Design a protein around this ligand. Structure first.
Ligand SMILES: NC(=O)c1ccc[n+]([C@@H]2O[C@H](COP(=O)([O-])OP(=O)(O)OC[C@H]3O[C@@H](n4cnc5c(N)ncnc54)[C@H](O)[C@@H]3O)[C@@H](O)[C@H]2O)c1
Ligand SMILES: NC(=O)c1ccc[n+]([C@@H]2O[C@H](COP(=O)([O-])OP(=O)(O)OC[C@H]3O[C@@H](n4cnc5c(N)ncnc54)[C@H](O)[C@@H]3O)[C@@H](O)[C@H]2O)c1
Ligand SMILES: NC(=O)c1ccc[n+]([C@@H]2O[C@H](COP(=O)([O-])OP(=O)(O)OC[C@H]3O[C@@H](n4cnc5c(N)ncnc54)[C@H](O)[C@@H]3O)[C@@H](O)[C@H]2O)c1
Ligand SMILES: NC(=O)c1ccc[n+]([C@@H]2O[C@H](COP(=O)([O-])OP(=O)(O)OC[C@H]3O[C@@H](n4cnc5c(N)ncnc54)[C@H](O)[C@@H]3O)[C@@H](O)[C@H]2O)c1
Lengths: 331, 331, 331, 331
């Protein structure tokens, strides 16, 4: 069937640009704004710049290189014209329908599969491409979570570590660009930390990306946890894992294990580099995790690995990848 | 009577800090959050830093320096206990009750005078201290307005220009720190320029600040206009004014007029300096507009003048000065 | 003859990327560092991202896409092997040999022309592509200045305002991203303003960009001047020109002039747009000036135009255009 | 005796303000620039703002509240009149004379003690106040190094972990504000990660701060190590310590330990808080390290702790303190 998107925001537009170049068909887009705003933001992105194609619109459609996309503005999933558009797969990027109770609503909209682009509650399955994607059974799995941007950077690295060396416990910190859940200047928020001026602060905040890695790598259940620090950058992040392994290693063995995963089984998902790169060098990179080899440290069995990831673009490519998988499998 | 504050935000909290240090007694603050958050934001400020005094709170009041202050979470100004609390002067800084129509609600609640800290629609009077405050009339003016931050910075200067030389036409641009009406990252908004990422962009935006100056200095009616460029700083702004005067002058003469005013009549509102300062140097300056004398240029009768202003602190001192005026004349 | 670049920094590398894609042959590059560093900085740029191609090096050469470019590290220009490399045209982008007398040293190295990529002093001719490029006389011009990034944005516009409406007086201000002549945090500088923290201030600094337009447009001699405000952005600027013209006009009228120039005689140099763009949308745009049509204001004869420019990319393209000109006309 | 300061930069000037507010007499300041500049730089600070005193100057002295303070521009330590000023303790804060063999010239010039505000090479001793100042020996120790901002932040925490539970191994990352050894925009540098533009990048960098902790807590030799991440903030850093302890602990045990140290023996050096603060909240805080109580986590015997530190102010205070001890111990 066709793909439909609810929530045309940061992940939403990026997934669109990507699905668009791969030649996947997006038939309807629903946000809470007029088509004129939907088309301006798609044409101009502050981070990824000019859209490479022609964008136009009318009161009911988005026109991209001549193809037409229904763009609506229904604040409720139930009433979104899924079936009538030919949409079997609904990417759900609003950020407000992560309880699978609420995401279920696209189904009686006529949608066949919902893919929550964030961690879900009561979903059918959480998938992280590269790690447990073979776990997908189209007979029983309909409401799928693709996990968070962070859990997708942790999982591929943790998997290599657990298989080559065995992991006993682990803690991690992600130093992350700010996102739209934060304030620009001091302002009321559910979290007294995120309530602060995102661009002139380092903001410690909680995360469950670590705990959630246990969903795709059960062996870590109860042995992985972490924290997050938000910093004044717009997109782009880095995961700082500190693992306690089951044997003694040297940086070279750890790096060598990561590099081989990156050129074999985890190809396209996990990457590995030896250059002296900074944040800007990984922006718009499509990998879920980019191992910066020169930073690895090992104190015997307490090792420390670092993986960069573009929380927008990389995630976005993962959503795209999943959608193609839900599709090739009969959806 | 006692001062209440509806809208505990950026301006709301600085005014409070200023009124608190002056001896005025605030008696109720209303916002949309809980007392914990309120107490917290008051105590810690990313820009003005720590609140100098003890702040605490129960599920009812905030205790600043032991003095309890009622605090509520009422979304409708009509349902606010101003009277019940002994609140004569309400400070409206939520920035949603700017049409004096809705603003009028605080009157039903028991208030006698409302002060909109923004450009209002349908107000009794619009005052800019130092310029036309001698025109406030207790018996007829109930819904005052202290104008915008930018308006407050131009007026003092324009007054000086007009009286000393006379203005024929004048256009201006204000380079201004971002504010809470902008976005962190590209997100929908009514103004498409402001839908964009605030901190990594120079954003042109429209401003009524020049036109609104004509309301306090009527001679400029239809003779003054401007633009605004929002830049990536969190507080502090500068006004670049290009005036076409009625006689040929030298920068020296223009500087001399502006200095004389700063030392005399406008003392306390207009400041003048010859030091080579920069943004951070005016952060937390209470003045309405500071003249950077070394930047004055003059081509005959065409002059260019600049004036920094701290859009949060400077402006908030004006609000306090007015609240304290409205009170010095019986509410 | 071939091109050689002296000073491989922000402008030199961009000019290179461009000369490179245009097929011009750069034979020798000189800076103050090793090839590993020249190669790395070239390969990874924070603003324009990965170099689209292969970069390698050795103790003696930089290999860009398989081509060998002699790369050296000589502090004195008299000592650069221009002759030994076959370099006829040198690009002087160090920023330290702007007094033509010092830049003369290049000719005593075997070089036949020098193009100072900055306002010069003592130059044969200062050329602003599109405005007065026809005056370059190969027979008599050898040390050519391409003027500042700002002058190049003011001249294409002022030229149009002078021919269609006639300019009588003008003052401009340029809100500019910071450059390497500034400081990261407070440090001594010849300029007490530039001595301050570039990324957290708005820094007023002086500029001769206005008076310089008078070299390419003699009619502005004694009639145009300005200022600059450096702000927290990496690259990209905007010029705010306030002109006093000779006839009364309407904004639409002024835009129409600009737009026409933009699609005819100034094609490729000047650009005109009507979309509601912000800074990020003009990064890596190749024009010298991009008229932001919706910003024009007009109070009779006093007009106000705004033109964006990317001080790195735009300027670089102009340097590449001048080099190609110099070459097409016989060295 | 009297204090002399070589290298009036970020640390030099903060140290002066501090020593000045304490009653310590600074007799001579040397740097490489003119007096006008030093004074202006002292008077106006982008981060801590205005110097709260009268600053004036003339061709040979600075004047802070009336006191004359000799000021000079001597490029070589050997040629400094340290003695002619009756200067006994020289604060070597330029950043180029951290090699004791080089800082030794201050002695030749007449001083008796040299305090290098940075990790040295060949120093008689390395002190980190609150941890090992009891080892300073006046008769033997003449060229003292006060360690790095980072070590001073790790040390007190490590001391408390080691004594309460015992540290097996531990690694750490410091998320740190940028500093003057980094670049504003891509420019050659020895470190290719630091050659990159500082204000728009998360720059990974090497630090020996974990290894110097062993110099003061010798039980850590070969059991401690780590990385640094520079971020687009101007001042303030946070340390993220992942320590493997000698027994199973709970977050409370650990914080209980740390709280107790702060209220007790480490008072004034270590601090403890349970508020949900962020970076700006610690700027200008005088403590070497501040435990963010709520950020602590523990997986059995693996713990993670976070401690903030204003790298200019916390440190300059430590520098002031050591100056005070070297004086009280007798020069
Ligand atoms: N940005 C990241 O780095 C990142 C990475 C991976 C996953 N995610 C997750 O993806 C989601 C989207 O985040 P994002 O950054 O794109 O945020 P965003 O705030 O840019 O996008 C949210 C969009 O939803 C729209 N919206 C709000 N309510 C709506 C509704 N009821 N129906 C239709 N449209 C509605 C908003 O108009 C907006 O365009 C969140 O769950 C987020 O946590 C974000
Ligand atoms: N920020 C400045 O530079 C500044 C300066 C001068 C004037 N102004 C004008 O002042 C106003 C305040 O802006 P601010 O910057 O303080 O913004 P803000 O967004 O920081 O303040 C708004 C606060 O009021 C609360 N509020 C919103 N709806 C509420 C309601 N319905 N009833 C009660 N409280 C509610 C919000 O939750 C928040 O606490 C605006 O009108 C603005 O245009 C702002
Ligand atoms: N940055 C811009 O926006 C821009 C735009 C227009 C014009 N310009 C002008 O062009 C020049 C370059 O500015 P930039 O921003 O590229 O500078 P930059 O600081 O980025 O680079 C200058 C390079 O010159 C090298 N260098 C220094 N001295 C040298 C020497 N004596 N011999 C050889 N190489 C030497 C430096 O090591 C450095 O790599 C300046 O004149 C600038 O004023 C800059
Ligand atoms: N800034 C911090 O975060 C921090 C923290 C702890 C330690 N330090 C260490 O302190 C030192 C200074 O750092 P800063 O950040 O104050 O640096 P900075 O670059 O601001 O200070 C340098 C000052 O030293 C002056 N100087 C340089 N060479 C000189 C010389 N030859 N003679 C006299 N004066 C000279 C410079 O002109 C400038 O005034 C470095 O060793 C640094 O690593 C800095």
């Amino acid at each position: 069937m066709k793909v439909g998107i609810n929530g045309f925001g940061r992940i939403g537009r990026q997934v669109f640009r990507i699905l668009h170049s791969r030649g996947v068909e997006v038939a309807l887009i629903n946000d809470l704004t007029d088509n004129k705003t939907l088309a301006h933001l798609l044409k101009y992105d502050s981070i990824y710049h000019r859209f490479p194609g022609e964008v136009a619109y009318d009161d009911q459609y988005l026109y991209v290189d001549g193809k037409a996309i229904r763009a609506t503005a229904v604040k409720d999933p139930k009433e979104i014209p899924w079936a009538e558009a030919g949409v079997g797969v609904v990417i759900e990027s609003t950020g407000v329908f992560t309880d699978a109770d609420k995401a279920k609503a696209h189904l009686e909209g006529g949608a066949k599969k919902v893919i929550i682009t964030a961690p879900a509650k009561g979903e059918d399955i959480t998938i992280v491409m590269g790690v447990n994607h073979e776990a997908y059974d189209p007979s029983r799995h309909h409401i799928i979570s693709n996990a968070s941007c962070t859990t997708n950077s942790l999982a591929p690295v943790m998997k290599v570590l657990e298989e080559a060396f065995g992991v006993e416990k682990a803690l991690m910190t992600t130093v992350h660009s700010y996102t739209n859940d934060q304030r620009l200047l001091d302002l009321p928020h559910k979290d007294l930390r995120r309530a602060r001026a995102a661009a002139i602060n380092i903001i410690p905040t909680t995360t469950g990306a670590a705990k959630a890695t246990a969903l795709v790598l059960p062996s870590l259940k109860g042995r992985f946890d972490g924290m997050a620090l938000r910093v004044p950058t717009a997109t782009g992040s880095i995961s700082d894992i500190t693992a306690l392994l089951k044997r003694e290693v040297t940086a070279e063995e750890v790096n060598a294990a990561l590099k081989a995963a990156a050129e074999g089984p985890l190809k396209g998902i996990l990457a590995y580099t030896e250059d002296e790169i900074v944040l800007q060098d990984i922006v718009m990179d499509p990998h879920s995790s980019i191992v910066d080899a020169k930073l690895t440290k090992a104190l015997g069995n307490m090792v420390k690995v670092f993986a960069w990831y573009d929380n927008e673009w990389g995630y976005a490519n993962r959503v795209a990848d999943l959608v193609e998988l839900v599709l090739r499998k009969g959806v």
